[PDB]
Structure formats: structure tokens, C-alpha cells
Amino acid sequence: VAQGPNGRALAESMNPDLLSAIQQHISIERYASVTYLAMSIWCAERELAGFYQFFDGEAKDEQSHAVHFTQYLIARSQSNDLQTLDAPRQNWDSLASLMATAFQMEADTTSSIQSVYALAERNSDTRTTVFLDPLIAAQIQSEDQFAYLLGRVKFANGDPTALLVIDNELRAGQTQRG
Amino acid sequence: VAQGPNGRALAESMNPDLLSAIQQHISIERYASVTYLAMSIWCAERELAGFYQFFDGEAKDEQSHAVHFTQYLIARSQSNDLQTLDAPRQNWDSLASLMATAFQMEADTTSSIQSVYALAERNSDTRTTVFLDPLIAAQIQSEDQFAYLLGRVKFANGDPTALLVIDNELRAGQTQRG
Amino acid sequence: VAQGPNGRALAESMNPDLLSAIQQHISIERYASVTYLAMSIWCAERELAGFYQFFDGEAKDEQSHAVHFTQYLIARSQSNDLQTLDAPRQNWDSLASLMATAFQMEADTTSSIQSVYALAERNSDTRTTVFLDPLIAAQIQSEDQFAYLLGRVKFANGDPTALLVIDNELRAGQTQRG
Amino acid sequence: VAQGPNGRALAESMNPDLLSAIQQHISIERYASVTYLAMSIWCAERELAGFYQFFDGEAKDEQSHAVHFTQYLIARSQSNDLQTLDAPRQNWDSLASLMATAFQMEADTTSSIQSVYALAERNSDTRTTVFLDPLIAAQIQSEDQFAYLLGRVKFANGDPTALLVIDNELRAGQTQRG
Ligand SMILES: [Cl-]
Ligand SMILES: [Cl-]
Ligand SMILES: [Cl-]
Ligand SMILES: [Cl-]
Ligand SMILES: [Cl-]
Ligand SMILES: [Cl-]
Ligand SMILES: [Cl-]
Ligand SMILES: [Cl-]
Ligand SMILES: [Fe+3]
Ligand SMILES: [Fe+3]
Ligand SMILES: [Fe+3]
Ligand SMILES: [Fe+3]
Ligand SMILES: [Fe+3]
Ligand SMILES: [Fe+3]
Ligand SMILES: [Fe+3]
Ligand SMILES: [Fe+3]
Ligand SMILES: [Fe+3]
Ligand code: NA
Ligand code: NA
Ligand code: NA
Ligand code: NA
């Protein structure tokens, strides 16, 4: 039995380029987390309590995704390399602009997973594609959800009354088409 | 064993300037109470039932704070001196203006506590600073809450539709960021 | 009513040096979080599942502390400034060495709070000292706990048998003197 | 409607090389089963009751996997061909050596699935890749688990005291990092 780079027994070696791609993706998940924290704060500063609660939870969930990836590297006997984390964006001129950035963040998270996926396929790493499959499925749901929240906020067309109604929807947990 | 000014056994004497400051602060709490009663009436007169219910409860809570201070003076064997109470402000041109006065009242209540606190520290009265600590903590929460209600009302920008939505939030007990 | 730097109604202005100190402390909490994540991974890589579970939870708790501070700045109508986050330490020669770093991290977290506390006192910011008081109390408990875990691991004196026993204690939730 | 090789209605023909690969893989699952039975006996002979119970269950689970594959061939209207089964390895000089063989058996089971998977992809057999996906996911978990048990036994470094502690973990059902 061979030992993997992290010292554990090695079921199958991993291409170093794929390993690097996964380590970078963990940073993307962590960056999504702190981005959603910054968004939660921006909303709290404007008394948009439902949006604050929503993004506070999204921040925690993205962190959980990052940890989920660290556990996969452990399971593959690969080294983790937790990286320096950039500061998030923190300023927006409107809730619609914030929601556009949020949607882009979600879509960019999927693109990162897709890039890891393509590298795993090039390397015939079926463990990794199988690991990623349910994460892509979750991303479809999150993209659908963020398109819903962004589209609903855009429909409000900057009317504070409409934004208060939507804020109350989010506080109540009404965050998807359902 | 010595007797304190109110006749009870005296654990430790209190500086008369500090005593006067606490008696004055009790009046501030009582004045906040009747101010919130006046605000509850103003809201009721305009059918803002959720704001009426909110301020009706705040009036009762501020009175409870006043009584809490009277009990501390009893516990310190100090005399209470219930003072003449000014009439509250009773007229506002808008709910936003009323909420600004409410926020100021809350902040001024904290300033009064802070002034008592500084005098207690100058007099090395650790019982009093310890007594006040949780009241300051409660004030932070109340200031955060009143900034939320004021900011949400200002966001409404005088639109009756938005103010009805917020009124219904308060009736439902949705009075904080959460 | 004045507006604070984050746009909300301002109960009382905050010294910019104190604000900067709180923003820096939030980074310390976030850095403790990612440090404990790195420690959880190191333990998982060596099959120390109880230590992995312990530090996984500590990472989540430190993040919660960071968010708690961001909410205080919101409550004070002060701007948040989420900073770039350094990469954590990730390599240790032994569990005893890891636990020494963990204890130091906990003690350094308290020192950071103490530094903010002293600045608040210099500025007569009683809201901030009151906010910090229960966090210092929690730090005493965490320092006591980490001294217990470190001391118990050192008592094991590198014997794998003893470290397996302690690992099982942590998995069972036996993490303090009790 | 066409009839498949096993006589049932045929949804889509299967490449004979892929069929042979699946039939061979069923033998690999059956061989893993009897290997884990032999390991359970080796442990029972040395009073390692927790390891005996663990491998007794693994033997049953691997047999269930074999049957699961036989049901897939039935579902595809393909013939099953249950093969002669080699005798398992039965002798080891130490528990660490046994656990190394167990880890290798688990990794080799995954390699067999991976080989079937690659053949299905070459043949555009999407039913088979979909069938195998959750089995690969289960293999990741089993490899992580066996790396944990092997690594924990190696950490014991042949100390009977440590091996008794781990034996008791397994008897209690503590068989993974968790
Ligand atoms: Cl908007
Ligand atoms: Cl951006
Ligand atoms: Cl208004
Ligand atoms: Cl006034
Ligand atoms: Cl050690
Ligand atoms: Cl260090
Ligand atoms: Cl051994
Ligand atoms: Cl062998
Ligand atoms: Fe994510
Ligand atoms: Fe996401
Ligand atoms: Fe009060
Ligand atoms: Fe008050
Ligand atoms: Fe206290
Ligand atoms: Fe902390
Ligand atoms: Fe800590
Ligand atoms: Fe199997
Ligand atoms: Fe298996
Ligand atoms: Na409107
Ligand atoms: Na309207
Ligand atoms: Na021992
Ligand atoms: Na021993």
C-alpha cells in the first residue's frame, strides 16, 4: 500500500494539476462565503432584515461547501492548502446591483466546479466527477433561486414598497419559486 | 451596623452626587415612558395600529426600567425621590419625524445611564457600575432596534402603502432585524 | 438625528481608532476560525477523529464570534471592513505542538479583545466595554478548556495509546474539566 | 420488441465485452466478500472481537453489492454467469498487515468498477455509467473508512493496549472519522 501526499493510505494517485484545481476551488467557495457575509451586512445596514438573514445563511452554507471539499481531499489522501482569502466586494448602489453580483457569484462558483470537472474527465478521475455531480445539481437549484430573487427585485423597479414586501418574503423563508 | 438614608442597614455609603444622578435618571426613564405613551396615541389617532401597539409596550417597559432603578436605591439603603414629570411631546408632522424623536429618546436614555456610570467610576462605586452594565447592554439592543424601525420608515419615503406594510410588521411582532 | 458612517441613525459617535481596532479584531476571529479548520484537517489526516471533530466545531464557533462583532458595528452605525485573510499555519510535527499553537491562538484572541477593551476605556465607550465583557468571560472558559486539552495531550507524552484514549474523549464531547 | 440474451424484453443491446466486464466484476465483489469473511475469522482467532464484527458485516455488504450487480444484468436483459470463486487469503503476520490487505481490496474493488465504467463510456452505455455512479460514491466513503482504520491501527504501532482500545471502538460501531 502506497501513502498519499497527506500521509494517508492512497487508493489512487491524483494528477497534481487536478489537485491544484480543487484547492483553488475551495478558495472560490470560501470567497463566496465572505462575499455573502458582506452582502448580508450591506442589507442589514439598510434595514433589509430578510435579505440580511438570507445572505447570512448563504455565507454559512458556502463555508460548509468549502469544508466538504476539504474532506474530499482528505478522503483522496491529498494535501489541503488553505489559501489567503481576498477581501470581498462591499459596496453597491442598490439592492438590484447587489443581487446581480450575487447571481454572478453563484454562476462563477458553478463555472469553477465545471472547470474542475473537465480536468477530472481529462484525467479519467471518476471519483472526482462522481463527487462533483451532486454539487452541480445543487448549483442548478441555487442558480434558479438566485435568478428568482434577482428577477423579483428587478421587477420591483426600485420601489421601496415592493422591496419591503420582498424583504418580508425572505424573512419568512420564501426564497424560491417553490 | 450603620443605617442608610432610607433607614435600612447600610452595606456601603453612596456619594450624594451619585444618588442625585440616579434619582434624576429615574425621571428620564419615567419621561421616556410617557413619551412612548404619547407616541402610541399619535399612531392610534392615524390608524397605525402596529406602531400604536409597539409604543404602548415600550411605554410599559420604560416604566419597568424606572421601577428597577427604584429597587436598586432601596437595595443600597438610599432614599428615593420621585420627581415632578414633564409633559411629553405630543405633536409630529409625520411618522418619520416621530420615529426620529423616538430614536433620540432612546439614545438620550443611554446617555443618561452613561453619565451615571462615569460618576460611579469616579466614586469607585462598583456595585453601581455592575448594576448598570446589563442596562447598557439592553440599550445597545434598543438603539439597534429603533435605528431599524426609523430606517425602515425612512426607506418608505412617506408612501402610505409602505407604511401600512411596516405597520402590519409591528402588529405581528416583527420589530427587529432578527 | 445624525447618521453614522454606515448610514444608520447614530446613537453615539465612535472614535476612528476604536473602530479600526474592532475591524482588525474581526480579522483575528476569522483567522482563528481558519486556523482551527487547518488544525481539524491536520488531525483528520492522522485519523485523530475526535480532535478533528473538536476543531471543526471550534472553527465554526470562531466564525460566529466574528459575525457577532460585525453585528455590533452595525448596531453602532459603524462601517464594517472585511479584510484580506492570511493563510493559516498548516504543518505541525506532533499533536502536542498543534495543541500549543491552539492554546496560543486562544490566548492571542483574548489579548486582541483586551486591546480593544483598553481603547474603549480610554475613549469612555461604555457600550463597547459592556459588549466585550461576556466575550472575555467566554475567553476565560476557552483558555481553561484549551489548557486542559493541551495539558492532557502533554501528559500522554507522545504515547499513541494515550492519544487514542484522549481522541475518543473528544469524540464523545468530553472536552473540558467539567 | 427484441429479446435480450437472458430472454427478457430488451431495452437496448449491450456490448459483449462490457457484459463480460460486469460478470467479472461480480466475481470481484464476491471475492471481496469471502476475503472479509477470512479477515473476520483471523480477527476472531485472536480475540479481536470488534474487528471480527466489523469484517463480518463487510463480508455481508460486499455480497449485497454482488447481488445488486446481478439485478442490473437482469434489468438489462443480459445473462448472468456466476463464476468459480478463488479461495481468499487467510494468513497475516499482524493486524496492520491484514488492514493493509483490506485497504488494497477496497481500492482494487473501485479499480474494477472504474474499468467497467471506462468500457461503458467507450460504448456510450449511459445506463451503466449512471448505475455505477452511486457505487463509486460509496467506494470513496469505504476507501476513506478503510484508510482511517488502517491508519489508526498503524498509529498503534503494534502496542496491544492501543489495539484493544481500537477493537472496542469497532465493537461500538465507531468505524469512521465521523
Ligand atoms: Cl433596487
Ligand atoms: Cl463585482
Ligand atoms: Cl413618514
Ligand atoms: Cl423633541
Ligand atoms: Cl504528541
Ligand atoms: Cl504558529
Ligand atoms: Cl499490528
Ligand atoms: Cl494479498
Ligand atoms: Fe458553494
Ligand atoms: Fe453558491
Ligand atoms: Fe429604559
Ligand atoms: Fe429605552
Ligand atoms: Fe457584566
Ligand atoms: Fe473567538
Ligand atoms: Fe477562541
Ligand atoms: Fe463492493
Ligand atoms: Fe468494498
Ligand atoms: Na408602493
Ligand atoms: Na404603493
Ligand atoms: Na500504551
Ligand atoms: Na499500553
Side-chain angles (χ1 to χ4, degrees), chain D residues 98-161:
Chain D
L98 182 154
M99 291 305 307
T101 302
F103 181 83
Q104 188 72 57
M105 182 78 261
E106 197 70 74
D108 287 351
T109 300
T110 312
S111 296
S112 182
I113 298 177
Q114 291 172 263
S115 182
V116 179
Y117 203 108
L119 235 202
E121 290 192 315
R122 279 191 295 277
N123 285 101
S124 299
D125 180 353
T126 313
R127 290 178 184 78
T128 295
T129 61
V130 164
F131 176 79
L132 296 175
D133 280 332
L135 310 183
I136 293 173
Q139 285 306 110
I140 297 171
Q141 294 304 124
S142 289
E143 292 170 347
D144 193 11
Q145 171 179 45
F146 277 53
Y148 164 83
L149 297 172
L150 169 60
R152 214 163 160 91
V153 165
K154 283 165 71 73
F155 183 57
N157 191 31
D159 182 26
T161 306

Side-chain angles (χ1 to χ4, degrees), chain B residues 105-169:
Chain B
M105 182 78 261
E106 197 70 74
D108 287 351
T109 300
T110 312
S111 296
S112 182
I113 298 177
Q114 291 172 263
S115 182
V116 179
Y117 203 108
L119 235 202
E121 290 192 315
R122 279 191 295 277
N123 285 101
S124 299
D125 180 353
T126 313
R127 290 178 184 78
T128 295
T129 61
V130 164
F131 176 79
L132 296 175
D133 280 332
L135 310 183
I136 293 173
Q139 285 306 110
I140 297 171
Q141 294 304 124
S142 289
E143 292 170 347
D144 193 11
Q145 171 179 45
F146 277 53
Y148 164 83
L149 297 172
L150 169 60
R152 214 163 160 91
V153 165
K154 283 165 71 73
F155 183 57
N157 191 31
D159 182 26
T161 306
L163 297 179
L164 291 165
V165 169
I166 300 169
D167 188 64
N168 287 333
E169 299 166 6

Side-chain angles (χ1 to χ4, degrees), chain D:
Chain D
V1 169
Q3 309 296 140
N6 75 3
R8 305 182 83 214
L10 177 68
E12 180 165 347
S13 60
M14 180 180 288
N15 169 260
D17 290 328
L18 180 54
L19 173 60
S20 178
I22 294 167
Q23 294 172 341
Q24 182 52 41
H25 178 75
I26 290 165
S27 291
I28 291 296
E29 301 277 4
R30 295 176 60 216
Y31 187 72
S33 180
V34 74
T35 293
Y36 296 150
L37 176 59
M39 290 173 174
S40 78
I41 292 166
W42 188 96
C43 294
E45 294 173 335
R46 289 155 183 78
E47 321 312 334
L48 296 167
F51 283 86
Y52 147 75
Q53 291 185 27
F54 175 73
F55 280 114
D56 179 84
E58 293 302 294
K60 292 167 182 170
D61 290 346
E62 294 294 347
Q63 177 68 21
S64 295
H65 303 171
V67 176
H68 182 59
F69 274 89
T70 70
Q71 288 280 301
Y72 177 63
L73 290 184
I74 289 160
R76 291 301 306 273
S77 309
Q78 300 297 313
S79 296
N80 269 281
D81 187 20
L82 295 169
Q83 296 170 342
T84 296
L85 192 64
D86 290 357
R89 177 166 178 181
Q90 294 178 281
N91 302 121
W92 292 270
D93 290 331
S94 69
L95 182 61
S97 177
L98 182 154
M99 291 305 307
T101 302
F103 181 83
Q104 188 72 57
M105 182 78 261
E106 197 70 74
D108 287 351
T109 300
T110 312
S111 296
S112 182
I113 298 177
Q114 291 172 263
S115 182
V116 179
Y117 203 108
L119 235 202
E121 290 192 315
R122 279 191 295 277
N123 285 101
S124 299
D125 180 353
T126 313
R127 290 178 184 78
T128 295
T129 61
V130 164
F131 176 79
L132 296 175
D133 280 332
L135 310 183
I136 293 173
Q139 285 306 110
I140 297 171
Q141 294 304 124
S142 289
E143 292 170 347
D144 193 11
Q145 171 179 45
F146 277 53
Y148 164 83
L149 297 172
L150 169 60
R152 214 163 160 91
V153 165
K154 283 165 71 73
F155 183 57
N157 191 31
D159 182 26
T161 306
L163 297 179
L164 291 165
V165 169
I166 300 169
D167 188 64
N168 287 333
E169 299 166 6
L170 273 57
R171 191 198 287 250
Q174 183 184 298
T175 65
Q176 296 176 103
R177 170 168 71 259

Side-chain angles (χ1 to χ4, degrees), chain C residues 54 145-146 148-149 169-178:
Chain C
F54 175 73
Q145 171 179 45
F146 277 53
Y148 164 83
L149 297 172
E169 299 166 6
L170 273 57
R171 191 198 287 250
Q174 183 184 298
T175 65
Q176 296 176 103
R177 170 168 71 259

